[PDB]
Design a protein around this ligand. Structure first.
Ligand SMILES: NC(=O)c1ccc[n+]([C@@H]2O[C@H](COP(=O)([O-])OP(=O)(O)OC[C@H]3O[C@@H](n4cnc5c(N)ncnc54)[C@H](O)[C@@H]3O)[C@@H](O)[C@H]2O)c1
Ligand SMILES: NC(=O)c1ccc[n+]([C@@H]2O[C@H](COP(=O)([O-])OP(=O)(O)OC[C@H]3O[C@@H](n4cnc5c(N)ncnc54)[C@H](O)[C@@H]3O)[C@@H](O)[C@H]2O)c1
Ligand SMILES: NC(=O)c1ccc[n+]([C@@H]2O[C@H](COP(=O)([O-])OP(=O)(O)OC[C@H]3O[C@@H](n4cnc5c(N)ncnc54)[C@H](O)[C@@H]3O)[C@@H](O)[C@H]2O)c1
Ligand SMILES: NC(=O)c1ccc[n+]([C@@H]2O[C@H](COP(=O)([O-])OP(=O)(O)OC[C@H]3O[C@@H](n4cnc5c(N)ncnc54)[C@H](O)[C@@H]3O)[C@@H](O)[C@H]2O)c1
Ligand SMILES: [K+]
Ligand SMILES: [K+]
Lengths: 236, 236, 238, 234
């Protein structure tokens, strides 16, 4: 379907949920997908096998995206196998929801390190590896909570709002070397609140993944520094 | 080959510029394209012929998109010809730039009538014809000037900012019947202070047209009431 | 309270509701307030009398803000009385809510003319009158419906979204002559229980609360703020 | 010049620049201002003295706003002196500008810790101390770079964009107990081609916007971001 000049993609935290669908979608469109996981290899291998069954190209790779050295090593491993890397999706993320008055500084750092620091490392390394080839596209998976806020999510909103803003700054740095940076802000996705969603249902993971795909693809070639809402009309 | 459940599209003001590219791009993806024009049939026919020579489906249809009765009649013609209409692009637009102190009320009305009232009529009629079949997607071609403003463009910014806000309201009204409404906000397009554009060049009409296509396509099925920036990083 | 370099203000549609409060608030801060009305003079005169009895300066002035010639004449009248005009608030506005499929073109024009065209005429004339003295501030009273949209309000959202964007363009044009243009976007204001659940501050806003925001954007305290949109919605939209 | 129901305010990083003006402006409007500093007491004392000589109420207080235990202790000290605290301004901030490819992880953390973590701690404690009395207002000093991004400022934009989003979440949590949270996003401020008003903003102009958001005049404004950039971003 969608046109891609590039040949491969790394997706952080891709073993399950939205990360998994991104991998499926992109593999189905001819990209070699690198599925990142932290601990359980079984789940990632099962996804890789499922894609290979369908004739697609996929590999798995173990690392903690919040660890600088692990992320650097992982990219070097990909560069050795494929000769380079055209696309990166920073999807790795956690939640630790508490009312602010009950929330320790450690709770805040936890979510900042895994959600925002992870993405900084990814975007930085994408910049290093893609500048050689003078081409690339990077997508940061943010959230409606980063635009709008939410009760009990001071730490998560902070990290996703920081991600959105940070992505703009990278877009300026990547622009002359033709490396684009964009964010997606999904609403409520499957895997009462529905009342407020105009389309009247939760979004599928696939619908988020096809938006990520568009931003990576050649079709979005004059789009950089933008935030793409995928929330069913919940926030406009 | 972006995926479309729908089979045809109407594009206002499609004889030339961005409108023409939208027609080319969508016809190349298997949609039957209705090319709207006001006065000169030669130009529209030439485009229609060009597309048919490539094996695509295209027709031309004459109307003033600011005239309610003309727009209604045109849609009824398309409904009888094809059986329905799945997609609409409100692209018809003009400029009449002057400093505000030099601008007459008629200068303001001119740009409001052709840019915003035209879009209201289109969105309204899209809602009537598409609600039957409980499916549709509509794109309003707005502008960076609608988000940001500009010297000498009080009337243009008014009309495009009104378009963007109006589109959101339609999105609420179309949501339960699965009719999506979205806006595109192009930056400067070929058709300088390129200095200020991070990607360091003007956008092509294609690049705007492929963003429109994405918002019409099935890939954007959880995206409604959104505004998609296509400005090369000039506004983030 | 708030510091104003300017001496007077025109407020469109000021006889009642939010417009009235703006007039009260600004008169209470030492400005001479010009209260615009279309038809009923009784209500405007009552408000003018109330303010004079408190020691404030006020006058009333009749015009349709959607009529260019009426608005031009009104400004000339004010210029003759006071010698100039430092502040303008475009507050005149109407609603005509319908689902889009039931809405006539004339329903759309009605709201555009009264809400957006009115503001264009005000902002334009403000620019002409304030550029002489190289000083002014103008506020456009928009709405949360202009940022966010709403079912049944294709015409209103259009007009207020247009007003917001149009204000920014005027800000660029006014900037070198130190004429500032800004918008306020009020949420739901009193002058219910469905709306209120969703409002974090858990109540409708008062007219006074919108009027003190307008006042801040006119005042010297907002002197580095231009082309901005100030939300006054109790957290309903962030 | 402005009405305040509350009686006092804490301002982080208030010894100099924008922080200092906020202190001057708020003290000149009848608030007792607590001037926070990290290291150099001379500068803070001089400011406190200057304000007392003018008849105003001021004190200084030493702490690192990025340190949870320091910030908690400081608020407890204020509560014992004044009986409570109605207003807080998270102004403490730094920059460490580099192109991303030249930027170490520690350069990133440095700016996150001092700009965003500092604000989290302030907002959280403001929530604890103001809930008692069911009244308060808090302002986060963010930046245009948080809305818009900038070359060489991946870390700064991250921290200020995070601050802007975070403040909204606090606004939800504070709303029940009538505690408002808002951000200011200043443009380029003095210690130009692109700025419509054609000059850098003064610190005073930022300080009067902060004051408005703390004052009773902004009582139906919460979760908002107030641009103070002279038209440089709209
Ligand atoms: N589910 C939603 O409603 C929703 C809404 C808005 C945004 N998002 C965002 O979309 C993304 C994916 O959500 P999801 O539905 O896949 O959730 P999920 O429950 O699958 O969790 C995210 C994935 O990231 C991985 N991960 C987390 N930290 C990591 C690290 N340091 N290194 C490597 N991998 C890591 C996890 O293993 C997990 O598979 C996240 O960034 C999330 O915050 C989700
Ligand atoms: N050129 C740009 O940089 C740019 C940037 C952002 C947005 N846009 C918008 O995208 C759209 C396309 O503009 P373009 O640059 O291709 O301009 P253009 O002048 O090349 O073409 C616009 C077409 O729309 C037609 N049109 C105007 N009013 C009409 C009416 N009432 N009925 C039928 N047709 C009508 C014109 O006659 C023309 O055929 C416009 O809405 C424009 O405002 C353009
Ligand atoms: N009231 C709300 O909940 C609310 C919320 C958001 C925005 N607003 C905006 O606040 C502003 C004031 O509204 P309000 O609630 O006080 O409404 P209102 O109807 O009580 O007051 C508006 C006044 O302006 C008058 N008016 C309308 N068109 C006019 C014209 N062309 N010339 C002169 N006067 C005219 C009205 O008849 C009325 O006297 C409006 O711009 C409105 O769109 C209101
Ligand atoms: N200067 C500008 O143009 C500008 C523009 C937009 C935003 N801002 C913001 O305004 C705020 C004030 O900036 P300024 O221009 O006055 O800078 P400044 O460096 O002159 O003073 C800021 C103060 O913050 C203090 N500080 C930093 N980290 C701290 C910590 N962890 N604990 C305690 N104190 C700490 C510093 O020591 C310094 O005294 C900052 O948050 C900055 O990002 C400044
Ligand atoms: K967007
Ligand atoms: K704002």
């Amino acid at each position: 379907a969608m046109q891609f000049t590039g040949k491969n993609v790394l997706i952080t935290g891709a073993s399950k949920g939205i990360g998994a669908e991104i991998a499926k979608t992109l593999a189905s469109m001819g990209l070699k997908v690198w599925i990142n996981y932290r601990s359980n290899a079984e789940v990632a291998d099962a996804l890789k096998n499922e894609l290979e069954e369908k004739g697609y190209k996929a590999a798995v790779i173990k690392f903690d995206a919040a660890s600088e050295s692990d992320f650097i090593e992982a990219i070097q491993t990909i560069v050795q196998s494929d000769g380079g890397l055209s696309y990166l999706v920073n999807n790795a993320g956690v939640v630790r929801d508490k009312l602010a008055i009950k929330m320790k500084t450690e709770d805040f750092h936890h979510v900042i390190d895994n959600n925002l620091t992870s993405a900084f490392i990814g975007c930085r390394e994408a910049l290093k590896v893609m500048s050689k080839s003078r081409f690339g596209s990077v997508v940061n998976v943010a959230s409606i909570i980063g635009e709008r806020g939410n009760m009990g999510q001071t730490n998560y909103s902070a990290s996703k709002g920081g991600m959105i803003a940070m992505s703009k700054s990278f877009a300026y740095e990547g622009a002359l070397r033709n490396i684009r940076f964009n964010s997606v802000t999904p609403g409520f996705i499957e895997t009462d609140y529905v009342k407020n969603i105009p389309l009247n249902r939760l979004g599928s993971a696939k619908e988020v993944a096809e938006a990520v795909a568009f931003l990576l693809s050649d079709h979005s070639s004059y789009i950089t520094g933008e935030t793409l809402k995928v929330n069913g009309g919940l926030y406009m």
